Ligand binder design. Structure first.
Ligand SMILES: NC(=O)C1=CN([C@@H]2O[C@H](COP(=O)(O)OP(=O)(O)OC[C@H]3O[C@@H](n4cnc5c(N)ncnc54)[C@H](OP(=O)(O)O)[C@@H]3O)[C@@H](O)[C@H]2O)C=CC1
Ligand SMILES: NC(=O)C1=CN([C@@H]2O[C@H](COP(=O)(O)OP(=O)(O)OC[C@H]3O[C@@H](n4cnc5c(N)ncnc54)[C@H](OP(=O)(O)O)[C@@H]3O)[C@@H](O)[C@H]2O)C=CC1
Lengths: 284, 286
């Protein structure tokens, strides 16, 4: 069973490194060939991991994990024609919420792996977990990686897990990015009020999509946010302050488009999405 | 009838220059004596404008026009003890609202400012317009008459509340959007932004109504129409302030509207969201 990871970033390098410890043929693919210097944890002995460029990879793979940013998926897609066969299992190790991918077996994963890439140096911080829809192919993949540190959690129905992370992202990523601030911005009472209202907007969309969320869910997420230290950023905050594109369309945009589909009133979500969309269009 | 302007900036210098053309004893006052540069329009020949420092002034004025930013008003107030007599007409030529009561004088009036210009250091460039709108009363009628030979257009309003709130809304929509968006008005080419803009104006309208103003969806439409006339490169003062990492005039504008919304227990989600971010910026910069 052949395995590729596409996207040698924080998440992709972590997955490739750890899978290569038990499955040494596992292949890490980027735009061009290079070598990433990888730390399993901060201050660990450095480890180099080989990246093959698209042009270097001639064969097809049974499993392909895509770990690029959501706004980078469209650029990856055409390469799949040569990297995958009709039955290749394709796993999106990305945030947000597939139909753009012209293959039968495409699965959206929920990523619980924390790390950062600076230049060609990747530092993993904590966690090795992917939550994926439980099916024949993902069970087979789970079995394949059993001697690695990668924790594949199979969900009888992956929608709840996807939407839960969608909501966790929705509140604090929107606020820190639009606010151009670390999570310390939550010390403003008005910002916390906004954050809860924004989560409530997201929650009512999740509900109309058939998910079992509620005000309790919002309380739980606000409680998680209270645990974050002041200096903590979010991925969308880092992207906006470094003038990079945002993952907005697959996160706030997805939630927004579902809100409209259900004719919901979501003023907080709408406001947040309008500004993040405007940023994205300016960056284009 | 003597006139002073406090605040040698875009608005204050425009008013001083034009009033000095017909009322040469009109005095422009700043923190320190200097001579600044004024352009009547861009590329016009420079005009020297004399600025007297507070320490130089040894007389009172019958009319004092305060032309500073909203958050700068508190620092001006103690100087009025030395510049005004009991009956002095004080005109607060300033955006926002809710600050008139801070001025301990009986004759205090807001002016709604329709004068466009920019101050950079000691250089003021006027762009267009020369209008102030002020409540109609005996003292403002006397002031209007005084300045009749100048280019300054004093419009006396039967009820100044309307003009004040109209301007609050005009600021509320495009200044919040450009500032939070960190963009010129070109940001309005995004249809989602125009939808938000209109919803934001509607929140503002609902607050105005609770304050007793006859604003409606027609009012909102007229303001959206005005926005459609702005060229892409145009900024707003709040936009310029936020990109310059300066304090904003938020507390007397979006802040005031927000506090009135809470006072009336209204549901104003767009306004609340906008204010929450502008306030967070202000708390971080301060
Ligand atoms: N802690 C984390 O980092 C977490 C991340 N996630 C999610 O995981 C996903 C990946 O995030 P993350 O690893 O942080 O992102 P990174 O920016 O660290 O990695 C993305 C990688 O993909 C590469 N890439 C970009 N375009 C292409 C392309 N067309 N073909 C091949 N490779 C490409 C980039 O290369 P280049 O350097 O040249 O741009 C970069 O190496 C995101 O959706 C994120 O939201 C979720 C939880 C935590
Ligand atoms: N186009 C425009 O400029 C328009 C402005 N307005 C409104 O008019 C008001 C004035 O704005 P604008 O003229 O642009 O602002 P400016 O910053 O151009 O002018 C403010 C001036 O007041 C001076 N000042 C500040 N504090 C004091 C003090 N304690 N004592 C004496 N002088 C002081 C400042 O000094 P220093 O030079 O040292 O900073 C500056 O010269 C604002 O509320 C604005 O929203 C309304 C419509 C248009």
């Amino acid at each position: 069973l052949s395995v590729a990871i596409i996207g040698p970033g924080a998440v992709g390098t972590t997955i490739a490194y750890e899978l290569q410890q038990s499955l040494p043929h596992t292949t890490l693919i980027g735009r061009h060939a290079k070598t990433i210097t990888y730390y399993t944890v901060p201050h660990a002995p450095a480890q180099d991991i080989v990246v093959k460029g698209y042009e270097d990879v001639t064969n097809t793979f049974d499993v392909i994990i895509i770990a690029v940013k959501t706004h980078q998926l469209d650029a990856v897609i055409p390469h799949l024609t040569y990297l995958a066969h009709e039955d290749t299992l394709i796993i999106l190790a990305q945030n947000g919420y597939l139909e753009h991918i012209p293959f039968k077996n495409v699965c959206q994963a929920v990523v619980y792996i924390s790390g950062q890439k600076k230049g060609d140096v990747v530092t993993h911080f904590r966690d090795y977990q992917l939550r994926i829809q439980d099916n024949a192919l993902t069970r087979q993949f789970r079995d394949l990686v059993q001697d690695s540190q990668i924790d594949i959690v199979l969900e009888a129905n992956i929608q709840q897990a996807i939407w839960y992370k969608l909501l966790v992202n929705l509140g604090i990523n929107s606020i820190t990015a639009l606010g151009r601030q670390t999570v310390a911005i939550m010390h403003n009472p008005e910002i916390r009020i906004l954050c809860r209202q924004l989560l409530l907007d997201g929650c009512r969309v999740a509900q109309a999509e058939g998910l079992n969320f509620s005000e309790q869910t919002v309380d739980t997420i606000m409680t998680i946010y209270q645990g974050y230290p002041d200096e903590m950023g979010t991925s969308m905050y880092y992207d906006i302050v470094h003038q990079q594109p945002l993952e907005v369309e697959a996160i706030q945009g997805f939630i927004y488009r579902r809100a409209r589909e259900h004719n919901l009133d979501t003023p907080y979500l709408d406001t947040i999405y309008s500004f993040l969309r405007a940023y994205q269009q300016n960056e284009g």
